[PDB]
Amino acid sequence: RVSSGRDLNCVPEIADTLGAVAKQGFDFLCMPVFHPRFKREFIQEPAKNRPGPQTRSDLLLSGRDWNTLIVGKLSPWIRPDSKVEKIRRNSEAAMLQELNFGAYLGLPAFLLPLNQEDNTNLARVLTNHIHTGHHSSMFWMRVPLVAPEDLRDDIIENAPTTHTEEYSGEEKTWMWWHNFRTLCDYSKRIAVALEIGADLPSNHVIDRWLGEPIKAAILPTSIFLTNKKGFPVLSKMHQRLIFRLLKLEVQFIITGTNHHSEKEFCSYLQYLEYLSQNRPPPNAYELFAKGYEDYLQSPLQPL
Amino acid sequence: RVSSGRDLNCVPEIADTLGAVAKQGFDFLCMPVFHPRFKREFIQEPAKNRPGPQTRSDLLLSGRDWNTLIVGKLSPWIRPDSKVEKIRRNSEAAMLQELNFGAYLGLPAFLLPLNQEDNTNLARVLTNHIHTGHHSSMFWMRVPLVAPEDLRDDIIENAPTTHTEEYSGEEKTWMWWHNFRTLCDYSKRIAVALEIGADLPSNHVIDRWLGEPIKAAILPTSIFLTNKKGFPVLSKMHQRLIFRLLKLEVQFIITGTNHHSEKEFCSYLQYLEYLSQNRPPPNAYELFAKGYEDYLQSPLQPLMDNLESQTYEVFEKDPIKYSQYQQAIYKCLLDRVPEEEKDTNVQVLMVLGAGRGPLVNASLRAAKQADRRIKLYAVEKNPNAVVTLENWQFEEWGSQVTVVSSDMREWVAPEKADIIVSELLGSFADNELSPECLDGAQHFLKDDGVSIPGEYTSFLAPISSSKLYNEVRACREKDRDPEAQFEMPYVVRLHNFHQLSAPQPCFTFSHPNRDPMIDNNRYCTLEFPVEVNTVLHGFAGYFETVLYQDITLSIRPETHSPGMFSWFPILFPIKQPITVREGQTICVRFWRCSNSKKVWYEWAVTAPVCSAIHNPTGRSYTIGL
Amino acid sequence: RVSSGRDLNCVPEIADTLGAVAKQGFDFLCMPVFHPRFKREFIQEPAKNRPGPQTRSDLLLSGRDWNTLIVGKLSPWIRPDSKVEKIRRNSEAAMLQELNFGAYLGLPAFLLPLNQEDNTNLARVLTNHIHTGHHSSMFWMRVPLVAPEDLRDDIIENAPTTHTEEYSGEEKTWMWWHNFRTLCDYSKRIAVALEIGADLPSNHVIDRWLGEPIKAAILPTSIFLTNKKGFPVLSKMHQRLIFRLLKLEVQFIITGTNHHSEKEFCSYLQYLEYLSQNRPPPNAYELFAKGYEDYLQSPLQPLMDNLESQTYEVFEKDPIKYSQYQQAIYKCLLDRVPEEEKDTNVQVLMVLGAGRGPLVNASLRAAKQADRRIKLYAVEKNPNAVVTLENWQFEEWGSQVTVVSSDMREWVAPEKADIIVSELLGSFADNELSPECLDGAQHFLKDDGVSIPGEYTSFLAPISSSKLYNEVRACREKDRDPEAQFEMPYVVRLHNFHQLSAPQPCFTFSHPNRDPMIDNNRYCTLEFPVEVNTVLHGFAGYFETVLYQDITLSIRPETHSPGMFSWFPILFPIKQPITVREGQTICVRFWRCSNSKKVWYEWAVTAPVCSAIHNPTGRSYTIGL
Amino acid sequence: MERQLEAARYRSDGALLLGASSLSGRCWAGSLWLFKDPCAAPNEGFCSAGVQTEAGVADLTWVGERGILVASDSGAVELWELDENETLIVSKFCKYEHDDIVSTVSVLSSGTQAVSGSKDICIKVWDLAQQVVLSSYRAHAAQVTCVAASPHKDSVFLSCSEDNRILLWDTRCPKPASQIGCSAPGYLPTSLAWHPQQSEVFVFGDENGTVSLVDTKSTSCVLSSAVHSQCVTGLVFSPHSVPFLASLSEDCSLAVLDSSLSELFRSQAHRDFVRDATWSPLNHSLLTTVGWDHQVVHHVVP
Ligand SMILES: CCc1cc(NC(=O)C(=O)N2C[C@@H](C)CC[C@@H]2c2ccc3sc(C4CCN(C)CC4)nc3c2)cnc1N
Ligand SMILES: CCc1cc(NC(=O)C(=O)N2C[C@@H](C)CC[C@@H]2c2ccc3sc(C4CCN(C)CC4)nc3c2)cnc1N
Ligand SMILES: CSC[C@H]1O[C@@H](n2cnc3c(N)ncnc32)[C@H](O)[C@@H]1O
Ligand SMILES: CSC[C@H]1O[C@@H](n2cnc3c(N)ncnc32)[C@H](O)[C@@H]1O
Ligand SMILES: [Cl-]
Ligand SMILES: [Cl-]
Ligand SMILES: [Cl-]
Ligand SMILES: [Cl-]
Ligand SMILES: [Cl-]
Ligand SMILES: [Cl-]
Ligand SMILES: [Cl-]
């Protein structure tokens, strides 16, 4: 079936939230380790001396739960590439703090966002963190399949969305990743959490991500169409994309609030499972060679 | 003068020919090892069984003559890249035969030609020959400055030479080389023998070869114009090119027959020598730094390491910079002490990093030139130089100078200083941690105190030099990262390179630093406009410092202090060279990072293509505090 | 002649002293860099704050003088291994200070003394100094040939000098060095300055220092006997020792005051020079191979690789060996063809591995000397040498010699040979695969045919040479096993080493080999009796060969062919040196293994202690078929 | 004589002219020989005239009855005059105007001018009487493999080089060279031969062993035949009204072809490269070939 997790930016009680997402059937939870709106100052007083605690305690979960069930999230206010020097210097220390706390918890993965072209200082800070104390830490780079600028509604009078063909531009969101991925010298501990939007781009923009380390695919509740009965479903193109992603054996991450409020949160995950089961069963070739997927072996020399 | 050789494709008697070219004044001879028209078959009979000998014997010359005087030539009939499969297979074996015989003779170099776009199989055979028995063999790739197709006369009726502009096409002959050079994985034993034709191309086509390993420049007799008396000369553009090549110290190779038949073969070589002698003689800077051309040295760390004696010695032999320091101290003394207080107001003047005492003597001379009183402190943490300082103080200075043998960041001063004079700058200004040292020493500076230097600034500029790239690549050492040599800077007197954009400022520091939130970490982004196609290999680094008011020092080529030879430029290389086209902008990023113990630089190119972040966490290069 | 220096512990004026020792004829001066009695305190006040200067200034000499003429000396009051903790720490600080000042001056060498058993902390401080800012600094360890305790006069009533036998104790002063040398992990920058006393010990105590890096030999004036006229001379044993040291090319250092006060200081140095001039002049072998002393070279593989021209050239410049081959061919011709058939019986004589044709000319000369008829075949697979062979055959030999350019194992001969002549031997005889080549070429040998050489045999001998061990250790290369250099042999003119047991035969091959079950794999066990305490570092290898009857060649030192310089000895090293005591037996094992493509040697020591099996499966060294 | 025979040219009265070089050994020189007895060649003893040149000879051609034109390895073009007694051979001139090896020479129809091609990519026109170079062209982009003067026009000649260009020339035109595309970019041309009767037609061999017949009017490959297994080094027509075409090659064979490029005679007599072949003016069925095996073979053609 499907391995999956729930993406939340609001966690009032970590134990209650984890129990809820477990009863909903999810395998893991992406949550912030510090409160998302709790901006911190590291240079200028008096906010520099804000009394602790700075976040919730590590005693609230067992070590196994931290190791297997919790995926950390970088706070959205952290801007390492800000054009403002003060904000840049402060966000450097904030990002280091959050990454170090995530490694202290022993989290299996940590989500960091890519939503502009210049993520150079972000890459620098992350690369330095990777080479400062070797851990088993994995990092998921949240990259949208379509940039937010190229997805906005054409509702700005004096700034119209151009309706002309741009082949290379439509793929810019991969370039970001690529540049970031090149700046970190192809670190094995850096992967992609591809976020999928309402409008799907041309097939070449999607094919671009073929051969890339996609560990996670992020689906919002907004992209789910409503069924006649009231259940959530997806378009035929979204379903083709879901099958293509299932072949790569990626983990699906549900984000956003429940808009199909008549049902539970189980409905989105149930649609994903129903898609996974209704796929042609494994033939003998794929059944035997499923474990050999991308396994490098030296050539035999029978002579 | 000129080191040179004669290129001949006709050698009837090897001894007579060698004696003739020696009497003509040439230093070496490029000749074929097999007869150029003696094509050989290796597969199909009966020509496969042609009875030997296949060429002249190796006994005809001494081993020294083979080692020093004879440059081999690949036979012109050998075509490893022929579209005909038979000719290709045969030329493979022929090229292997000739290269193996050249190595058997122990020849210092072997000429191979590049005169088409596809030399892939040629590169394959040569690369396999290089890795089959390691020798000291060198290979000169004969590449014409202008392709023969783009040099032909417009005398074909139904095939006219297009008279339109083609920027990239005019440089195709370099692309050939480049591709070949890339196919052989940048072998140090493969260089360029640039052949120069009658018509010289645009200046960018020529500048393309800046930073390339040009060992030889081939001049035919056809390009020589005839003098009124009848001697051979060259055009003014050809002469500019000859001077540019002489700067690179390449060997000139005369090819073709004697067309100025009234004279001897000595006339062409004599024109070259006459050009070489009539060049402005070496100035003191170039005279001293001629041997340091493209010599890679690790940056000194005067803070972490205690410098040797001769290092301080080469520092002290630099009168221009010490005169500048003396003038700056003089002006500061005049500006701080009015004339009616020359005998009442004594100034506290601390030399932080005194060395063996050139700055102390400069301060004394400036004091007596300005007619003011100063009390001198000579602070130095190197005890071996403190020995010299204390010997000086006993034998000459007296009680006026107080020698302090400690670190300026730790020293608890008895009184505060009116002026502090330091010499802690490097090639990249702050690469020797002058900011941290002067920050730690700032508490004993008076509230209205002056620091000499008052300011400094670093400069970066993208460069192209496959020569220096391969030199850095050859610095791989055992027991470390195979690519660590790329993630560290080198102090080097740059030569045979190509600046791609005007230098731009990188990091700037001011002393004293009144700022409450003191931080020496830096992050700079630089966009360099590039007007020409080239290949980025690294970034040259310079500095400019303001000692006091209009008294400044600089190694930046535009504002370089004349006759100052204390600093050479620095070089931050990159792992993989980056292709850059005309009009593109090279965007590079630079970080100055630090912790409690180390300071280091990180850098990465972001445009036109991204590279890896170099030296992350200072894993390959750090500067100790 | 002699390179030498003067050892002084009293230098009032450094310039005057240097001028004096220069006018006396000395090449360098060993002097203290700090005053010998000027003890310094580094911990406890008030002496901690002693006002400088702490020594004389570095300005008193030019950089070249410091680099070439001044050898530093550790102050005698520095005791890093004192039983007192305070003195230990203070001497650590002082030793670091003096070593750092010596490196600051750029001195070529620095003397440190060994005069007790425990020098552990001294070794620790020196090792840390070496790995802190590494320079080209060299260190001479002053070790006496006889300890001062074992040289004192028997003039203490209640402490008599025992007059009994102690073999190991008499060598204790070497043990010191060894332990020190082992504590510093065999640093190339740590050598021996052997001090020679009045009484010379037994010959084994002196032989102990064979194979040790002796850069200096220290002679005091006290050991010099007075001549009839009043000049200084030495005993016959001292002179034997001086000649033995002169062969090692060490520098001689005169120490002590002038006791022959009638003369000058020139007299001691002049006696040394007079000894150096009155040595037997250099023999041709030693004259040629003087530069090859202890030079490590990889073994040639004439079968897999095609040899260069100058290699064949150095092979041909050897008249003794070619005279031997000519005499052997002559005797075989006489023994095969009776006198009454000299004009009717023509002999087939094939030179397998002809090179450039010295054996062909030798065969021709032997034929005309024996007055017999021969038809010659010159078989050679190196086509570059086939060029020379065919030029010779066209210009001189004619149709009498037929040149065959192929491998002898593949060649299908037109007729069978009466005699086959080859020189396919290496330093280890069969290390160049002469057995396999001559076996493949055996089918075209006549039933009653003769092979020259008819037999050969290899010889092994355990050796002690920390010098050669460290040279092999320094051959570590990137991108391979860090210990592969130990699992491969080296052709080297052995020097500054010590044979530990008489050479014994290893492998033997006979040609022709009519055996049906032909196998060239070998397994040999050798027990070498050792009469002295030493440290095994490897095994020297030689060979003998019977060309025909009593005509033989040999590089084995006992039966070495006089004046033959075609082969140097070979060396099979071992990873870890093995301590061997007197009377113990070194048992070593050797394998000659092979497959279809490669042949290689495996070896391992089994006594007195086992080592690892070296080069298993030829993983580090193979000989290509 | 040197081992490698390069040129064999019959004079109108029947005398044979040989040009040879030494392409191996200590000396890399050349030699010229005249044999009034044709079957006595290549023996130097039964010789009519001989001369030793300083350097080797690459191509050779007659200049009337007493002039011998030589393309030398030294980059020189050399005219040797024949003695009054026709026993000596003397150098009339030797001009070094080419930079590299002169690989081919051909005398124009008037017999007063000549054309030469060299490995210096250049082609030069020579006035033999004045001993100067009238015109010097750089039309190709690789070494010139062959030049062949038109038998009927003194301003027209063919050239072919390793730049894959076949050029028809007309020195009267401002741009004299004109590229003949034949069919389409094929293999490199190596030999050229004008048709003796028709001035609009010629033949060329390539490096792949193919001989082709081209008509300048149709500027298209009229016919092509795979005659040899290796490169074609020479093409010589027979003097008869119905012309036979002898083709040489590096496969050490000689072929005789008709009008339709069909194979008639074929001789494996040479065991090395076949360099030159000329027909006897005394018997128009006899054909003399030379090669690098120092062999001079007389063939009888049906
Ligand atoms: C004026 C004040 C000043 C100057 C500089 N200037 C420089 O460093 C500099 O450009 N050059 C280049 C040329 C002029 C020569 C001098 C110096 C240089 C650089 C690199 C190395 S490596 C090296 C070896 C020494 C022997 N040991 C055993 C191994 C390392 N020696 C040098 C020497 C720097 N800092 C300050 N404060
Ligand atoms: C008489 C027949 C004969 C003799 C030998 N003798 C030897 O090998 C031998 O002892 N020496 C030592 C001294 C006499 C000098 C010659 C030779 C020797 C050994 C090792 C190397 S490595 C080397 C480099 C050359 C340049 N190239 C680019 C790299 C390798 N060159 C040599 C040369 C062996 N085999 C046979 N058949
Ligand atoms: C003239 S090169 C710079 C000089 O300043 C000295 N120096 C560098 N840093 C310090 C420091 N922190 N305190 C004292 N001297 C210093 C170095 O030892 C060298 O002599
Ligand atoms: C005189 S050094 C040994 C010589 O013998 C030649 N040689 C070695 N093995 C063979 C072989 N199998 N066949 C022919 N020549 C050989 C080498 O090429 C070299 O010239
Ligand atoms: Cl892709
Ligand atoms: Cl995809
Ligand atoms: Cl460039
Ligand atoms: Cl240039
Ligand atoms: Cl500035
Ligand atoms: Cl001690
Ligand atoms: Cl191996």
Author numbering:
A (entry chain C): 13 to 315
B (entry chain C), C (entry chain A): 13 to 637
D (entry chain D): 27 to 328
Lines quoted from the article behind this entry:
PRMT5 plays an important role in the regulation of diverse cellular processes via dimethylation of target proteins involved in splicing regulation, cell cycle progression, apoptosis, the DNA-damage response, and other functions. Due to its involvement in these critical functions, PRMT5 is considered an essential gene. It has been shown that PRMT5 inhibition by small molecules can selectively kill cancer cells with homozygous deletion of the MTAP gene if the inhibitors leverage the consequence of MTAP deletion, namely, accumulation of the substrate of the MTAP protein, methylthioadenosine (MTA).4−6 MTA is a weak, endogenous inhibitor of PRMT5 that binds competitively with S-adenosylmethionine (SAM). Compounds that bind PRMT5 cooperatively with MTA, and not with SAM, can selectively inhibit PRMT5 in MTAP-deleted (MTAP-null) cells and kill those cells while sparing normal (MTAP WT) cells, since normal cells have functioning MTAP and therefore low levels of MTA. Targeting MTAP-null cancer cells via selective inhibition of the PRMT5·MTA complex can improve tolerability relative to nonselective PRMT5 inhibitors8−11 by limiting inhibition of PRMT5 in normal cells.
With 51 as baseline, we observed that 5-ethyl-6-aminopyridine (TNG462) slightly improved potency while increasing selectivity to 30-fold vs HAP1 MTAP WT cells, with good human microsomal stability (HAP1 MTAP-null GI50 = 4 nM, human Clint,mic = 16 μL min–1 mg–1). Dose-dependent decreases in SDMA-modified protein levels were observed following TNG462 treatment and it was further observed that TNG462 was able to maintain a durable hold on PD response extending up to 120 h postlast dose whereas TNG908 only maintained a PD hold for 72 h.
